Protein backbone atom coordinates (compact mmCIF):
# COMPACT_ATOMS: atom_id res chain seq x y z
CA UNK A 1 0.00 0.00 0.00
CA UNK A 2 1.40 3.49 -1.05
CA UNK A 3 2.73 6.61 0.71
CA UNK A 4 0.91 9.56 2.11
CA UNK A 5 2.86 12.22 4.06
CA UNK A 6 2.50 14.62 1.07
CA UNK A 7 -1.17 14.68 2.15
CA UNK A 8 -1.43 17.05 5.12
CA UNK A 9 -3.45 16.71 8.32
CA UNK A 10 -5.59 19.77 8.98
CA UNK A 11 -7.12 20.72 12.34
CA UNK A 12 -10.79 21.71 12.05
CA UNK A 13 -13.58 22.84 14.35
CA UNK A 14 -17.03 21.20 14.71
CA UNK A 15 -20.32 22.47 16.24
CA UNK A 16 -21.32 18.91 17.09
CA UNK A 17 -18.23 16.79 17.55
CA UNK A 18 -18.05 12.97 17.11
CA UNK A 19 -19.27 10.86 19.96
CA UNK A 20 -18.57 7.14 19.87
CA UNK A 21 -20.27 5.18 22.67
CA UNK A 22 -17.89 3.38 24.92
CA UNK A 23 -16.94 3.20 28.51
CA UNK A 24 -16.57 5.83 31.22
CA UNK A 25 -13.02 5.37 32.36
CA UNK A 26 -11.00 4.13 29.44
CA UNK A 27 -10.90 5.28 25.88
CA UNK A 28 -9.60 2.30 23.91
CA UNK A 29 -13.19 0.96 24.02
CA UNK A 30 -16.12 1.20 21.55
CA UNK A 31 -19.71 -0.15 21.51
CA UNK A 32 -20.48 -1.65 18.04
CA UNK A 33 -24.09 -0.46 18.25
CA UNK A 34 -25.91 2.42 20.08
CA UNK A 35 -26.12 2.93 23.82
CA UNK A 36 -29.32 4.43 25.09
CA UNK A 37 -29.59 6.28 28.36
CA UNK A 38 -32.43 6.98 30.71
CA UNK A 39 -35.60 5.37 29.47
CA UNK A 40 -38.12 6.26 32.16
CA UNK A 41 -38.48 8.33 35.34
CA UNK A 42 -41.14 8.37 38.06
CA UNK A 43 -41.78 10.09 41.37
CA UNK A 44 -43.89 8.12 43.83
CA UNK A 45 -44.97 7.81 47.41
CA UNK A 46 -44.97 4.18 48.49
CA UNK A 47 -46.97 2.46 45.79
CA UNK A 48 -48.61 5.63 44.59
CA UNK A 49 -47.24 7.34 41.45
CA UNK A 50 -47.34 11.20 41.34
CA UNK A 51 -45.55 11.98 38.07
CA UNK A 52 -43.81 10.00 35.32
CA UNK A 53 -42.34 10.19 31.89
CA UNK A 54 -41.15 7.71 29.26
CA UNK A 55 -38.85 8.46 26.28
CA UNK A 56 -40.15 5.70 24.07
CA UNK A 57 -42.45 2.68 24.20
CA UNK A 58 -42.33 0.18 27.05
CA UNK A 59 -44.32 -1.59 29.72
CA UNK A 60 -43.00 0.92 32.23
CA UNK A 61 -45.98 1.18 34.52
CA UNK A 62 -46.36 -2.59 34.62
CA UNK A 63 -42.76 -2.89 35.79
CA UNK A 64 -42.90 0.19 38.00
CA UNK A 65 -45.82 -1.27 39.99
CA UNK A 66 -43.73 -4.40 40.60
CA UNK A 67 -40.71 -2.37 41.63
CA UNK A 68 -42.41 0.02 44.05
CA UNK A 69 -43.88 -2.98 45.87
CA UNK A 70 -40.31 -4.14 46.77
CA UNK A 71 -38.87 -0.87 47.97
CA UNK A 72 -38.76 -0.35 51.79
CA UNK A 73 -40.15 2.96 53.12
CA UNK A 74 -37.00 3.87 55.14
CA UNK A 75 -34.63 6.34 53.44
CA UNK A 76 -31.92 4.79 51.18
CA UNK A 77 -30.56 4.51 47.62
CA UNK A 78 -30.14 1.36 45.51
CA UNK A 79 -29.87 -0.15 42.05
CA UNK A 80 -31.77 -3.21 40.87
CA UNK A 81 -30.63 -5.24 37.90
CA UNK A 82 -32.92 -7.13 35.50
CA UNK A 83 -32.25 -8.34 31.98
CA UNK A 84 -30.49 -5.58 30.01
CA UNK A 85 -31.86 -2.84 32.26
CA UNK A 86 -31.06 -1.26 35.59
CA UNK A 87 -33.47 0.44 37.98
CA UNK A 88 -31.98 3.16 40.22
CA UNK A 89 -33.87 4.90 43.03
CA UNK A 90 -33.52 7.24 45.97
CA UNK A 91 -36.07 6.96 48.77
CA UNK A 92 -36.25 10.06 50.95
CA UNK A 93 -38.89 10.95 53.52
CA UNK A 94 -40.89 8.09 51.94
CA UNK A 95 -40.92 9.69 48.46
CA UNK A 96 -39.27 7.51 45.81
CA UNK A 97 -37.44 8.92 42.83
CA UNK A 98 -36.77 6.13 40.36
CA UNK A 99 -35.49 5.69 36.86
CA UNK A 100 -34.86 2.85 34.43
CA UNK A 101 -31.87 2.81 32.12
CA UNK A 102 -29.91 0.74 29.57
CA UNK A 103 -27.49 -1.60 31.33
CA UNK A 104 -24.82 0.53 29.53
CA UNK A 105 -25.56 3.80 31.33
CA UNK A 106 -23.24 5.23 33.98
CA UNK A 107 -24.85 4.78 37.44
CA UNK A 108 -23.36 8.01 38.70
CA UNK A 109 -25.09 9.88 35.87
CA UNK A 110 -28.34 8.15 36.82
CA UNK A 111 -28.16 9.25 40.45
CA UNK A 112 -27.20 12.77 39.50
CA UNK A 113 -30.35 12.86 37.38
CA UNK A 114 -32.36 11.53 40.35
CA UNK A 115 -30.84 14.07 42.75
CA UNK A 116 -31.63 16.88 40.34
CA UNK A 117 -35.25 15.77 39.85
CA UNK A 118 -35.65 15.47 43.65
CA UNK A 119 -34.37 18.99 44.24
CA UNK A 120 -36.87 20.37 41.72
CA UNK A 121 -39.74 18.23 42.90
CA UNK A 122 -39.10 19.18 46.51
CA UNK A 123 -38.72 22.90 45.74
CA UNK A 124 -41.79 22.92 43.45
CA UNK A 125 -44.13 20.83 45.50
CA UNK A 126 -42.80 20.82 49.07
CA UNK A 127 -44.94 19.05 51.69
CA UNK A 128 -47.83 18.46 49.22
CA UNK A 129 -46.09 15.32 48.01
CA UNK A 130 -46.72 13.65 51.35
CA UNK A 131 -50.49 13.76 50.82
CA UNK A 132 -51.23 14.38 47.10
CA UNK A 133 -53.39 11.91 45.19
CA UNK A 134 -52.30 9.57 42.36
CA UNK A 135 -50.95 11.33 39.25
CA UNK A 136 -51.67 14.64 40.89
CA UNK A 137 -48.35 16.11 39.78
CA UNK A 138 -48.17 14.52 36.44
CA UNK A 139 -49.54 17.08 34.01
CA UNK A 140 -47.21 19.77 35.28
CA UNK A 141 -44.09 17.78 36.18
CA UNK A 142 -43.80 15.18 33.45
CA UNK A 143 -42.38 17.92 31.25
CA UNK A 144 -39.78 18.82 33.84
CA UNK A 145 -38.97 15.07 33.89
CA UNK A 146 -38.74 14.95 30.09
CA UNK A 147 -36.38 17.94 29.90
CA UNK A 148 -34.03 16.47 32.57
CA UNK A 149 -34.14 13.03 31.02
CA UNK A 150 -32.93 14.60 27.81
CA UNK A 151 -30.28 16.73 29.50
CA UNK A 152 -28.71 13.91 31.52
CA UNK A 153 -28.84 11.44 28.68
CA UNK A 154 -26.54 13.64 26.55
CA UNK A 155 -24.27 15.47 29.05
CA UNK B 1 -19.19 8.41 42.44
CA UNK B 2 -21.58 5.59 43.46
CA UNK B 3 -19.51 2.41 44.25
CA UNK B 4 -20.87 2.45 47.80
CA UNK B 5 -24.45 2.07 46.53
CA UNK B 6 -25.07 -1.64 45.91
CA UNK B 7 -26.51 -3.35 42.85
CA UNK B 8 -29.17 -6.01 43.67
CA UNK B 9 -30.62 -8.68 41.37
CA UNK B 10 -34.40 -8.90 41.45
CA UNK B 11 -36.98 -11.12 39.81
CA UNK B 12 -40.18 -9.90 38.05
CA UNK B 13 -43.44 -11.63 37.17
CA UNK B 14 -43.79 -9.41 34.14
CA UNK B 15 -40.32 -8.23 33.01
CA UNK B 16 -39.38 -5.02 31.15
CA UNK B 17 -39.96 -4.95 27.40
CA UNK B 18 -38.70 -2.01 25.39
CA UNK B 19 -39.09 -2.59 21.65
CA UNK B 20 -36.85 -0.68 19.23
CA UNK B 21 -33.54 -1.27 20.90
CA UNK B 22 -30.55 -3.19 19.58
CA UNK B 23 -30.40 -6.96 20.19
CA UNK B 24 -27.14 -6.75 22.19
CA UNK B 25 -24.25 -4.80 23.63
CA UNK B 26 -20.94 -5.66 21.85
CA UNK B 27 -17.80 -3.82 23.06
CA UNK B 28 -14.42 -4.05 21.32
CA UNK B 29 -10.97 -2.98 22.48
CA UNK B 30 -10.05 -0.63 19.63
CA UNK B 31 -7.33 -1.52 17.04
CA UNK B 32 -6.34 2.23 17.06
CA UNK B 33 -3.99 1.43 14.09
CA UNK B 34 -6.47 -0.87 12.14
CA UNK B 35 -9.94 0.61 12.87
CA UNK B 36 -11.88 2.28 10.15
CA UNK B 37 -15.02 3.34 11.95
CA UNK B 38 -17.17 4.80 9.19
CA UNK B 39 -17.11 5.26 5.46
CA UNK B 40 -19.21 7.44 3.13
CA UNK B 41 -19.49 8.28 -0.59
CA UNK B 42 -20.92 11.69 -1.38
CA UNK B 43 -21.29 14.27 -4.04
CA UNK B 44 -20.77 17.66 -2.48
CA UNK B 45 -23.12 17.66 0.46
CA UNK B 46 -25.29 14.84 -0.86
CA UNK B 47 -24.64 11.37 0.60
CA UNK B 48 -24.99 8.39 -1.86
CA UNK B 49 -23.85 5.46 0.29
CA UNK B 50 -22.52 4.98 3.86
CA UNK B 51 -21.66 2.36 6.41
CA UNK B 52 -20.77 2.42 10.07
CA UNK B 53 -18.99 -0.32 11.87
CA UNK B 54 -19.83 0.83 15.36
CA UNK B 55 -22.03 3.30 17.36
CA UNK B 56 -21.73 7.03 16.73
CA UNK B 57 -23.23 10.30 15.55
CA UNK B 58 -21.65 9.71 12.17
CA UNK B 59 -24.27 11.39 9.99
CA UNK B 60 -24.34 14.41 12.23
CA UNK B 61 -20.61 14.89 11.91
CA UNK B 62 -20.56 13.86 8.25
CA UNK B 63 -22.91 16.73 7.35
CA UNK B 64 -20.59 19.16 9.11
CA UNK B 65 -17.56 17.72 7.35
CA UNK B 66 -18.86 17.63 3.80
CA UNK B 67 -19.74 21.35 4.19
CA UNK B 68 -16.01 22.09 4.45
CA UNK B 69 -14.64 20.10 1.50
CA UNK B 70 -13.76 22.03 -1.69
CA UNK B 71 -15.15 20.63 -4.95
CA UNK B 72 -11.88 20.54 -6.91
CA UNK B 73 -9.95 17.31 -6.81
CA UNK B 74 -7.71 16.73 -3.82
CA UNK B 75 -6.93 14.47 -0.87
CA UNK B 76 -6.65 15.44 2.80
CA UNK B 77 -6.98 14.47 6.43
CA UNK B 78 -8.90 16.51 9.02
CA UNK B 79 -8.23 16.27 12.71
CA UNK B 80 -10.70 16.80 15.50
CA UNK B 81 -10.55 15.49 19.04
CA UNK B 82 -9.21 11.95 18.99
CA UNK B 83 -10.29 11.31 15.44
CA UNK B 84 -9.14 11.85 11.89
CA UNK B 85 -11.25 12.19 8.79
CA UNK B 86 -9.63 11.16 5.49
CA UNK B 87 -11.03 11.88 2.10
CA UNK B 88 -10.33 11.84 -1.63
CA UNK B 89 -12.32 14.20 -3.76
CA UNK B 90 -12.34 13.26 -7.44
CA UNK B 91 -14.59 14.65 -10.15
CA UNK B 92 -16.53 16.20 -7.26
CA UNK B 93 -17.32 12.82 -5.66
CA UNK B 94 -16.00 12.59 -2.08
CA UNK B 95 -14.85 9.29 -0.59
CA UNK B 96 -14.39 9.73 3.15
CA UNK B 97 -13.68 7.65 6.20
CA UNK B 98 -13.20 8.26 9.91
CA UNK B 99 -10.64 6.58 12.16
CA UNK B 100 -8.83 7.04 15.45
CA UNK B 101 -6.03 9.65 15.67
CA UNK B 102 -3.36 6.93 15.79
CA UNK B 103 -4.39 4.94 12.74
CA UNK B 104 -2.01 4.34 9.81
CA UNK B 105 -3.12 6.93 7.25
CA UNK B 106 -1.66 4.97 4.34
CA UNK B 107 -4.11 2.14 5.18
CA UNK B 108 -6.96 4.62 5.12
CA UNK B 109 -6.12 5.97 1.68
CA UNK B 110 -5.63 2.52 0.28
CA UNK B 111 -9.15 1.71 1.48
CA UNK B 112 -10.46 4.92 -0.05
CA UNK B 113 -8.77 4.31 -3.37
CA UNK B 114 -10.15 0.76 -3.46
CA UNK B 115 -13.70 1.91 -2.69
CA UNK B 116 -13.45 4.57 -5.37
CA UNK B 117 -12.36 2.08 -8.02
CA UNK B 118 -15.35 -0.12 -7.27
CA UNK B 119 -17.84 2.69 -6.99
CA UNK B 120 -16.63 4.13 -10.25
CA UNK B 121 -16.66 0.81 -12.18
CA UNK B 122 -20.10 -0.13 -10.72
CA UNK B 123 -21.88 3.21 -10.99
CA UNK B 124 -19.98 5.21 -13.58
CA UNK B 125 -21.57 8.49 -14.66
CA UNK B 126 -24.73 7.97 -12.55
CA UNK B 127 -22.83 9.35 -9.53
CA UNK B 128 -22.81 12.77 -11.05
CA UNK B 129 -26.59 13.00 -10.96
CA UNK B 130 -27.98 10.31 -8.62
CA UNK B 131 -30.34 11.34 -5.79
CA UNK B 132 -29.56 11.13 -2.03
CA UNK B 133 -28.88 7.62 -0.72
CA UNK B 134 -29.57 6.25 -4.16
CA UNK B 135 -26.60 3.88 -4.03
CA UNK B 136 -26.88 3.01 -0.38
CA UNK B 137 -29.00 -0.16 -0.32
CA UNK B 138 -26.67 -1.97 -2.68
CA UNK B 139 -23.25 -0.39 -1.95
CA UNK B 140 -23.23 -0.09 1.85
CA UNK B 141 -22.43 -3.79 1.93
CA UNK B 142 -19.48 -3.27 -0.42
CA UNK B 143 -18.40 -0.52 1.99
CA UNK B 144 -18.85 -2.84 4.93
CA UNK B 145 -16.84 -5.65 3.27
CA UNK B 146 -13.91 -3.38 2.44
CA UNK B 147 -14.07 -1.75 5.85
CA UNK B 148 -13.71 -5.22 7.37
CA UNK B 149 -10.91 -6.20 5.00
CA UNK B 150 -8.74 -3.08 5.51
CA UNK B 151 -9.29 -3.16 9.25
CA UNK B 152 -7.73 -6.71 9.12
PR1 LIG C 1 -27.55 -2.55 26.75
PR1 LIG D 1 -5.64 7.50 20.40
Numbering used by the authors:
A (entry chain A): 19 to 173
B (entry chain B): 21 to 172
Which statements did the authors publish about this structure?
VAMP7 (also termed Ti-VAMP) (Advani et al., 1998; Galli et al., 1998) is one of the largest R-SNAREs, having a 120 residue N-terminal longin domain (Pryor et al., 2008; Rossi et al., 2004). It is involved in the fusion of lysosomes, late endosomes, and compartments derived from them with a number of target membranes including the plasma membrane and endosomes (for a comprehensive review of VAMP7 function see (Chaineau et al., 2009)). AP3 (subunits δ, β3, μ3, σ3) is one of the family of heterotetrameric clathrin adaptors that in mammalian cells has been localized mainly to tubulovesicular, early-sorting/recycling endosomes with a minor location at the trans-Golgi network (TGN) (Peden et al., 2004; Simpson et al., 1996; Theos et al., 2005). We show that the linker of the δ-adaptin subunit of AP3 binds the VAMP7 longin domain and determines the structure of their complex.
Crystals of this construct showed anisotropic diffraction to 2.8 Å in the best direction. The structure of the complex was readily solved by molecular replacement using as the search model the longin domain only of VAMP7 extracted from the Hrb/VAMP7 longin domain structure (Pryor et al., 2008). This showed two molecules in the asymmetric unit. The two copies in the asymmetric unit, which represent the VAMP7 longin domain/δ-adaptin complex (i.e., excluding the connection arising from the fusion protein) are very similar in structure despite their different crystal environments, showing that the structure is not perturbed in the fusion protein construct. Surprisingly, since there is no detectable sequence homology between the relevant portions of Hrb and δ-adaptin, the fragment of δ-adaptin binds to the longin domain following approximately the same route as that taken by Hrb (Pryor et al., 2008) and by VAMP7's own SNARE motif (as inferred from biochemical [Pryor et al., 2008] and NMR shift mapping [Vivona et al., 2010]). The interaction buries a total of around 1,990 Å2 of solvent accessible surface area (determined with PISA; Krissinel and Henrick, 2007) and is mediated by mainly hydrophobic residues, which is typical of the low μM KD interactions seen in the protein:protein interactions involved in transport vesicle formation. The corresponding interface on the VAMP7 longin domain includes Leu4, Phe25, Val28, Ile32, Lys42, Leu43, Tyr45, Tyr50, and Phe52.
